[PDB]
Amino acid sequence: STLADQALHNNNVGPIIRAGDLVEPVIETAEIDNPGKEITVEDRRAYVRIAAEGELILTRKTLEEQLGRPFNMQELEINLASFAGQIQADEDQIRFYFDKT
Template sequence: MSNVFIAFQRNEETRSIVDAILADNPEAVVNMQPAMVRIDAPNTMVIRRSTVEEQMGRPFDLQELHVNLITLTGHIDETEDEFTLSWKH
């Protein structure tokens, strides 16, 4: 089993994104750094637009993830409603 991860700039906007990721991925682990937050998950991580919208209290376009994105690892599968990182083919 290999971990996937995503890292964002650490700021007020990404706090809601991180909270949404943790809500939808109970096995995810957060590593807070002074200027960055990294979330690791075994095999697969799903970021759901609806969960981010719940946390933010406003509409959210998943393309907004890229504004504060630093790096990620895993295969990307992206739709209007979900951004998934995995090692599945």
């Protein structure tokens, strides 16, 4: 996909989240676990795009404090309308990051 390849190579990386109870926790978490970095947020109602330059991390840990109920990363991942950049993901966090190739 041309559009998906553009998403791959975007300078600005991060999740696009379906509208719902996860948007606010994920914005908070983008700020807390990426301290001091410039973050961009765009609300289109159906979904919200959160991005930063180079890399963006969201830890399972931070998301749980922010939801204040039990949290598995699956629940972020299954609620990703899309995303920009590449992904490294595990049981504790997801990293969106820029593609150097």
